[PDB]
């Protein structure tokens, strides 16, 4: 182990918590239903890239804010998808739970979405080098994106020997606290196993 | 040892066994699995087939061995030497 997770390194300075509620006696069950909601929303939706999931709790009422790059796929025109997610969220003992489906402004400056796309391409038949080149070149076009590093590990290309490869463009100072580093990790499922993809993206610094 | 307030711990199974055994003043071989049961002066004549781990060892109670537990007289590990 060499590098700690960038989100946890700047959790108290730059980034913000993905769950927002206060609990003293009911911390454990709140955590239980939080992780249940997270796994339910991760398993239910896989076509549209789920960027993020926030949960807010005040007594009975829960607000689950889910971000995706394709809101139309995860929502129903008559509310069918909305009805499904609502019904499966009531069943998680969430009492009164309401969902805010939202859309990301730039779906290529998000490290999680970039890793999602890279894994999806690498899964079926795409050579990995093409995946990293396309992802990096597409990331540089965005205005605020100033650096990007993409690294994949595993049996790349179905080989018998595991390998690690990484390509960088710009500045990625993982040691700098004020600089924000969007970090995204995802595991692509190939017939020869599992390939890990990590993406770091630098868009300016906050003070 | 067990506290004096709680009283001696004797399992109910072999308890009712020994009350039904001594009511007619006949002492047949009683087979038991509860090594943890202590020895009561009501066991003075009875002989127990106390479990060991492989088989049951016969133990004939006397006045001297009261207050101990059955498991004392059923040695578990068998060591003869190197």
């Amino acid at each position: 182990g060499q590098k700690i997770n960038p989100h946890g390194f700047r959790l108290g300075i730059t980034t913000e918590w993905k769950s927002r509620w206060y609990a003293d006696k009911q911390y454990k069950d709140y955590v239980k239903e939080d992780v249940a909601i997270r796994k339910l929303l991760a398993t239910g939706l896989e076509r549209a890239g789920i960027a993020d999931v926030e949960i807010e709790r005040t007594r009975d009422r829960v607000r689950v804010d889910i971000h995706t790059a394709r809101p139309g796929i995860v929502i129903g025109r008559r509310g069918t998808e909305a009805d499904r997610i609502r019904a499966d969220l009531e069943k998680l003992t969430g009492k009164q739970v309401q969902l805010n489906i939202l859309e990301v402004k730039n779906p290529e400056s998000q490290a999680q979405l970039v890793a999602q796309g890279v894994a999806e391409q690498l899964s079926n038949r795409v050579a990995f080098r093409r995946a990293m080149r396309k992802a990096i070149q597409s990331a540089m076009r965005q205005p605020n994106v100033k650096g990007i590093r993409v690294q994949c590990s595993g049996r790349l290309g179905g080989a018998e020997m595991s390998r690690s490869e990484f390509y960088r463009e710009g500045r990625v100072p993982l040691h700098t606290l004020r600089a924000d580093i969007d970090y995204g990790l995802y595991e692509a499922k190939t017939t020869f196993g599992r390939i890990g993809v990590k993406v770091w993206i630098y868009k300016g610094d906050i003070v | 040892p067990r506290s004096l307030k709680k009283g001696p711990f004797v399992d109910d199974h072999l308890l009712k066994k020994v009350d039904v055994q001594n009511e007619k003043n006949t002492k047949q071989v009683i087979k038991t699995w509860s090594r943890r049961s202590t020895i009561i002066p009501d066991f003075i004549g009875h002989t127990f087939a106390v479990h060991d781990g492989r088989k049951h060892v016969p133990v004939f109670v006397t006045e001297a061995m009261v207050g101990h537990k059955l498991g004392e007289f059923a040695p578990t590990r068998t060591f003869k030497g190197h």
Binding site: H7, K28, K32 | -
Partner: protein, 100 residues
């Protein structure tokens, strides 16, 4: 660990709440005062008749998801392996690495 053993731990907990709440506690209250007539009461013998799983002495703090029986932390209900991984990801509010 093993699914059967993760389940059996929970079954002990529901047994404990059902029995140890009053049955396996009133007998202890009987045995506490030497003044209380325990010997003829057979509160010892009556409490032996209860299932062993009633006793909390048979419980085991396992990891709430992982099932890990050792290296447990009561504040989080999580294994040392899992606490390290979720604290690093900023999942436990108000937890961070130390320096002093």
């Amino acid at each position: 660990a093993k699914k059967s053993k993760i389940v059996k731990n929970e079954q002990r907990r529901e047994l404990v709440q059902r029995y140890a709440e009053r049955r396996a506690e009133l007998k202890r209250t009987i045995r506490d005062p030497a003044s209380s007539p325990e010997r003829r009461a057979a509160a010892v013998s009556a409490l032996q008749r209860l299932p062993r799983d009633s006793s909390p002495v048979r419980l085991r703090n396992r990891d709430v998801v992982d099932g890990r029986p050792r290296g447990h932390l009561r504040k989080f209900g999580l294994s040392r392996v899992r606490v390290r991984e979720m604290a690093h990801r900023g999942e436990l509010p108000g937890v961070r690495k130390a320096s002093w």
